[PDB]
Design a protein around this nucleic acid. Structure first.
Lengths: 52, 50, 139, 117, 129, 134
RNA sequence: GGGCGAGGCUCCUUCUGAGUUCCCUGGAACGGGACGCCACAGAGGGUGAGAGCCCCGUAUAGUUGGAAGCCAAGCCUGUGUAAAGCUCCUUCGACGAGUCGAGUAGUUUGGGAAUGCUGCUCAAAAUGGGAGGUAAAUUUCUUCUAAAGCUAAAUACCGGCCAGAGACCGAUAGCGCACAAGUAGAGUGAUCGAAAGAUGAAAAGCACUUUGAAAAGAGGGUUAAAUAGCACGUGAAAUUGUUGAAAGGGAAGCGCUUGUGACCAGACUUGCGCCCGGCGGAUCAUCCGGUGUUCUCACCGGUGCACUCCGCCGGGCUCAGGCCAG
RNA sequence: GGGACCGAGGACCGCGCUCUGCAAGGAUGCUGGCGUAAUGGUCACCAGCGACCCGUCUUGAAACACGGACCAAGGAGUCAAGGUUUUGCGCGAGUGUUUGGGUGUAAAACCCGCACGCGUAAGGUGAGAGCUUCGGCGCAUCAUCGACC
RNA sequence: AAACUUUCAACAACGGAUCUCUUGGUUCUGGCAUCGAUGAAGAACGCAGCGAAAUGCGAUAAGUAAUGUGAAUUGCAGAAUUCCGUGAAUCAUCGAAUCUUUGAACG
């Protein structure tokens, strides 16, 4: 475990990659206060009653 | 930084504590693994020809 | 971080060691899977909070994930064995699933799984004798 | 560009790792015979000819007789103590002479020479 | 397009996040970002530090710079101003030069948290030709 | 796992060598284990079979039949135990081929050569037993 | 400077771990279950069916004897005014000819300063000769020494002596050849050139009786199996025989829809819930202690020894239950 | 008033009306026989109606012509080099470890010193995506006037 | 009605597909350097108790000497081996021999 830092610090021309997302928990992002405060009101439900 | 506990020969924790070595936070990309694994498995083959 | 329930589902949606695929549907052998169906709702190993019911000698054995021990498998399952009446088992399982916000969507599925196990433990009625018809009956 | 019969002259290098092991074992064989000695010979520092490469130095074939005498190493003993000698190269400049003389004195400082018999 | 051509799992999460935002918001910013996540790499040219530095020269400072592309470094720029840049990817040198100046680097999911409607944002694209 | 480069793991070569082995090689392949009493007496596990030995069959249709070895038919990798026979159609008795791996030696035909064989196997076994022990 | 030389390296060679313990199926366990052991060895093969521990081998360190090369601690000796390296200099310093070269013909190269080679005619030099650089003012300058010769290594390898492997082929495939295959056979000859593997664990390859001239047949027998009898694993189709069913006034075959005849897969057999009665048992509610968790929900133990709770049995009732219909 | 075909959906929500309710965003209620080859299905045949023998080639099209006794197995756009377009991936003014060298549990995997291949060493006006503090700011790209080499 | 023609089914034939197997091939890699007038490579003829071929050998002829191992060979028949031994074996190794007619082929 101690050597595992050293081995990746010695690879030339390679750094540990940076991900394109910072938080992988979508539920936290969507259900966050910041997102939910600016959303519109819902336009419907999961199941819609058919009129005719 | 998160840490990990060390276990002795009997399976019980020994009180030693080590820091997670920063490579376990890397992105998990199965598509890269599949592409890299496909090529690396071919590097062991021996030629065949009639 | 880089790992979440959404990521594990994306990695493991198309293939798993628990996956059973046939023409009539896709099943899952996951022990924390209440309906044995392949879905994000029911994939126990994917989710941070999940439930699972397995039979005991008499009654049911309910296992739930501990969120603060996701990296300690030996201490990650909260296990309760219910060997009292069926109604008392249903009350605890449903309260276990809905009274604190731990997978309230699985309340109905969990109670049904407990009912099936308790029903399966009941004695078995002897099947009626088979009846031959037509040509088979005349020979 | 296959207007000739290329198919009968096609070399495939499937022995690339096999030859590397063979080369590594041959180097080990030299160390087995010349046990304390290095498996190579000391070679001088030379300048590449062309104006494209004259700003860079490399290793030459062997040491010049003039720069071998300035170091203090006899001619007939140099190939015997692990020094390559080139009788075709001329110095033509003090810069090449000084660089290789200093290289030889550095070699003499690190040397362990055993009695003859 | 309905499904992105990429096999990146994290890119799928970004699309899923911004598909939700585009449906539940009236901001045209979210629809542009979503549609740019779907297109190919040649259709997403890199944006250099020199190009972003030009575009905030006049009055667009103290704003959020958003590119759905990779941000690269430029050796022609000697001084890099402090800026707030959110992008799909950053190079090692461009990220270091931005952080050395005193700016901050964001990902597209952090941008959703900070600016769910693309408020006070400068959206740029790379040179197609 | 095999390590030495001179060893081969080929099924084709192993089956060729086994079925085309010379008589001297076949003698080693036709070995049989020694009985428990003989193991603690000689410190020897196995020994090639021979004509004078007495064996007890421990595998096959002949459950626990005892008898003396009569022939070592190395050409088909079988031995002939006495009174272990089957009648042909004519009623003439023919021996039944028993493999040495299916028998255990109970009494050992003793001669100077076989005392030398048992001594060499014992010497190696005791050498490593003390090497492993101390 | 010479001669011995212990010993050493390389290669063959001897020996070195652990279940044939109990039960079931089976002709036979090498299969299933249980209880163990070895492992620097769970590569491979055989043994009556998938064997780490039945057997050969497999792994590591040793250990027994031998072979030929090379090295070598040491021990005997050496010898002759014998050889060798350098330094210095009022002395010397030999370097390859019918060969370069010029002309010409053929061929060749990316290469008329002929790229090289060969034949023919002529045929050299010694501060010489060859090649190159260069407008730089003359052909200055640079760099080598041809017509004599030896030399390991890195490089090639469809052949020779072996050895190890494969995401290769699996008997019309793979070499023409998995077999008494460059064989049988064809051609005057040069040459051309096939087809062809599999009984069974074990021949245990059918004693004996009977019919037949015999080939064989039938009983009887071996075997787990003859639905394996050497025309021998499994044994498709084309094509054929027998039996069973059916159709057939100058084609058959094909599509839609009934009918007849034959033959069949489903479905159903009851479940749920109430109200009484006979029971058989204390995981009834509550409270107390401990523990686990999602921190308010549970589980264990005690209290709760019976209008509460759980299972059975005997009745009544409700509901839901298959097919075709009015 | 007399027939025929059909019953899609599955808690509530709606439009409504003749409102203790209803024919109003899709069938319910009552009853009988049977509960087994009875419905149903597969074959073969009879019956009514329907129905050219396939492929190739030529041609505007037919027709001619060619191949077709039957079955089993085999049987035909592959590999390599060099260009090129598009998609995915890595790094990105850089990129490429694998000629070679160094480890190795040994044709794998891991690592890289020097060269080398390909590429690289700032305006005005009008539209214009998107922001906006509603004053305006304006990506990419196009049109025009430019500036420089 | 039978017979004949056709369809299906069962059994039996013809034929050898399918599955399974493989002391074979094919390709790659590694160590090594060894034919002949001291008669090679090839051709021929002989040799076994019972053999045609393949295989082995050469009138010492399915073989001799030496070394090692240690009790066989086997289809049949006949001899063995005393096993407390210079010693079975269609055994292995191999340093010594025998080695017909030719064939570079040489009175």
């Amino acid at each position: 475990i101690k050597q595992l830092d050293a081995v990746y610090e010695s690879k030339k021309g390679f750094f540990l990659p940076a991900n394109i997302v910072s938080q992988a928990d979508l539920s936290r992002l969507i259900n966050s206060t910041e997102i939910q405060s600016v959303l519109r009101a819902p336009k419907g439900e999961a199941r819609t009653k058919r009129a005719c | 930084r998160p840490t990990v506990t060390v276990f002795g020969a009997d399976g019980k924790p020994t009180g030693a504590t080590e820091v997670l070595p920063k490579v376990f936070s890397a992105p998990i990309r199965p598509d890269i693994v599949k592409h890299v694994h496909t090529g690396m498995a071919k590097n062991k083959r021996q030629p065949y020809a009639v | 971080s880089n790992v979440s329930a959404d990521l594990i589902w994306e990695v493991s949606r198309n293939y798993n060691s628990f996956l059973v695929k046939q023409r009539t549907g896709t099943f899952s052998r996951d022990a924390l899977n209440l309906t044995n169906q392949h879905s994000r709702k029911h994939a126990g190993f994917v989710n941070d909070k999940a439930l699972g019911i397995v039979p005991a000698e008499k009654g049911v054995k309910v296992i739930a994930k501990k969120v603060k021990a996701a990296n300690k498998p030996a201490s990650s399952l909260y296990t309760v064995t219910y060997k009292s009446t069926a109604r008392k088992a249903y009350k605890a399982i449903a309260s276990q699933a809905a009274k604190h916000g731990y997978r309230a969507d699985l309340r109905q599925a969990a109670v049904a799984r407990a009912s099936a196990i308790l029903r399966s433990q009941r004695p078995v009625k002897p099947e009626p004798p088979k009846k031959l018809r037509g040509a088979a009956a005349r020979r | 560009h296959f207007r000739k019969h290329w198919q009968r002259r096609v070399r495939c290098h499937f022995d690339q790792p096999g030859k590397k092991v063979t080369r590594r074992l041959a180097r080990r064989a030299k160390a087995a015979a010349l046990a304390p000695r290095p498996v190579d010979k000391l070679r001088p520092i030379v300048r590449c000819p062309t104006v494209k490469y004259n700003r860079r130095t490399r290793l030459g074939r062997g040491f010049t007789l003039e720069e071998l005498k300035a170091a203090g190493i006899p001619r007939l003993l140099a190939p015997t103590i692990g020094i390559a000698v080139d009788h075709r190269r001329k110095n033509l400049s003090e810069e090449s002479l000084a660089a290789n003389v200093q290289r030889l004195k550095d070699y003499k400082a690190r040397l362990i020479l055993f009695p003859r018999k | 397009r309905k499904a992105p051509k990429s096999d990146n799992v994290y890119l799928k999460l970004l699309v899923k996040l911004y598909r939700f935002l585009a449906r539940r918001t009236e901001a045209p910013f979210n629809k542009v970002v979503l549609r740019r996540l779907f297109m190919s790499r040649i259709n997403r040219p890199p944006v250099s530090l020199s190009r972003i530095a030009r575009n905030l020269k006049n009055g667009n400072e103290k704003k959020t710079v958003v590119v759905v592309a990779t941000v690269t470094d430029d050796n022609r720029l000697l001084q890099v101003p402090k800026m707030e840049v959110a992008a799909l990817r950053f190079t090692a040198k461009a990220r270091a030069r931005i952080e050395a100046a005193g700016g901050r680097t964001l990902t597209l999911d952090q941008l959703a948290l900070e600016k769910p409607t693309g408020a006070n944002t400068l959206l740029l694209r790379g040179p197609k030709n | 796992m095999k390590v030495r480069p001179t060893v081969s793991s080929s099924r084709r070569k192993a089956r060729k060598a086994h079925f085309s082995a010379p008589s001297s090689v076949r003698r080693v392949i036709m070995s049989a284990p020694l009985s428990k009493e003989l193991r603690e007496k000689y410190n020897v596990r196995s020994i090639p079979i021979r004509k004078g030995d007495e064996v007890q069959i421990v595998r096959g249709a002949h459950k626990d039949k005892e008898g003396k070895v009569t022939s070592v038919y190395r050409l088909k990798y079988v031995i002939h135990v006495e009174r272990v026979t089957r009648e042909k159609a004519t009623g003439q008795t023919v021996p039944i081929g028993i493999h040495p791996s299916n028998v255990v030696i109970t009494k050992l035909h003793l001669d100077k050569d076989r005392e030398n064989i048992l001594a060499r196997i014992k010497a190696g076994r005791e050498q490593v037993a003390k090497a492993k022990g101390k």
